């Protein structure tokens, strides 16, 4: 299975200055739950943003840099390499990866951040005409998690 995993706001902002615009611990828990024991494919910038591979899953980085050889990370140099990766593969970002893969993935696990943030990077437009809502779950709010959010699982029609 090939899936997108993304958090985007009401206007599809995903990033600002190479980091997330929001602090939302519950989204990171969501990411952990979905992708632990599976595979993440990310662009070079996204990788450099996190700074180290995420534990307990396969981390794959897409880059043109032939000098890229980082401990605990597998490197790929083509989109076509994604299709040779075994198991459940999550396209993990950033904007460039999402743009390249939205037409190719089986489904999407989206966290809709129900606010409007300043962004410099965006998830591409999509329409529910093309995507069935497999589930929609409101995120629980508390002292640590104060931005309303909804976890959507969309499956291509
Ligand atoms: N909210 C979210 O769900 C989420 C998730 C992840 C990231 N983000 C945000 O997204 C933003 C980063 O997105 P971005 O588009 O600037 O960067 P990115 O997608 O993370 O990385 C772009 C880099 O990926 C490599 N790449 C992409 N496609 C390639 C291809 N076909 N062949 C070879 N290399 C390829 C290139 O690396 P080289 O230049 O080294 O060749 C390219 O410069 C940040 O703000 C980050 O915080 C948000
Ligand atoms: C690039 C900035 O994003 C982060 C920085 C630190 C940590 Br720790 C996780 C993220 C992060 C959260 C994310 N959340 C969702 N729902 N989806 C993603 N594809 C995603 C990707 C990253 C990389």
Written overview of the protein:
The chain has 157 residues and is of the alpha/beta class. The protein has one domain (1-157): Dihydrofolate Reductase, subunit A, CATH 3.40.430.10. Helix content is 16%, strand content 34%. It has 3 helices and 10 strands. An 8-stranded mixed beta sheet has the order 5-4-3-6-1-7-10-9, sandwiched between helices. The protein has a two-stranded antiparallel sheet with strand order 2-8. The longest helix has 11 residues, at 25-35. The chain is globular. The chain binds NADP nicotinamide-adenine-dinucleotide phosphate and 7-(5-bromo-2-ethoxyphenyl)-6-methylquinazoline-2,4-diamine. 7-(5-bromo-2-ethoxyphenyl)-6-methylquinazoline-2,4-diamine is lined by residues 5-7, 19-20, 27-28, 31, 46, 49-50, 92-93, 111. NADP nicotinamide-adenine-dinucleotide phosphate is lined by residues 6-7, 14-15, 18-20, 42-46, 49, 62-65, 77-79, 92-97, 100, 121. It is classed as oxidoreductase/oxidoreductase inhibitor.
Query: What is the CATH superfamily classification?
Result: Dihydrofolate Reductase, subunit A
Please give the count of helices.
Answer: 3
Strand order of the largest sheet: 5-4-3-6-1-7-10-9
CATH domain class name: Alpha Beta
Distance between the termini: 15 Å
Gyration radius, to the nearest Å?
15 Å
Structural class: alpha/beta
Estimate what percentage of residues fall within beta strands. 25-35%
Order of helices and strands: EEHEHEEEHEEEE
Bound molecules: NADP nicotinamide-adenine-dinucleotide phosphate, 7-(5-bromo-2-ethoxyphenyl)-6-methylquinazoline-2,4-diamine
CATH topology: Dihydrofolate Reductase, subunit A
Domain count, please report it: 1
Tell me the helix content.
10-25%
Largest sheet: 8 strands, mixed
If classified by CATH, what would the architecture be? 3-Layer(aba) Sandwich
PDB class: oxidoreductase/oxidoreductase inhibitor
Keywords: dihydrofolate reductase, dhfr, OXIDOREDUCTASE-OXIDOREDUCTASE INHIBITOR complex
Assembly: monomeric
Entry title: S. aureus Dihydrofolate Reductase complexed with novel 7-aryl-2,4-diaminoquinazolines
């Amino acid at each position: 299975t090939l899936s997108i995993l993304v958090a985007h706001d009401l206007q599809r902002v995903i990033g600002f200055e190479n980091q997330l615009p929001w602090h939302l611990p519950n989204d990171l828990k969501h990411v952990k739950k979905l992708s632990t024991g599976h595979t993440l494919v990310m662009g070079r910038k996204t990788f450099e943003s996190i700074g180290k591979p995420l534990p307990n899953r396969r981390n794959v980085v897409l880059t043109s840099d032939t000098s890229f050889n980082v401990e605990g990370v597998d490197v790929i140099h083509s989109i076509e390499d994604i299709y040779q990766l075994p198991g459940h593969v999550f396209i993990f970002g950033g904007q460039t990866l999402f743009e390249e893969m939205i037409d190719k993935v089986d489904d999407m696990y989206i966290t809709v951040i129900e606010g409007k943030f300043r962004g410099d990077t965006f998830f591409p437009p999509y329409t529910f005409e093309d995507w069935e809502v497999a589930s929609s779950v409101e995120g629980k709010l508390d002292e640590k998690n104060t931005i309303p959010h909804t976890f959507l699982h969309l499956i291509r029609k």
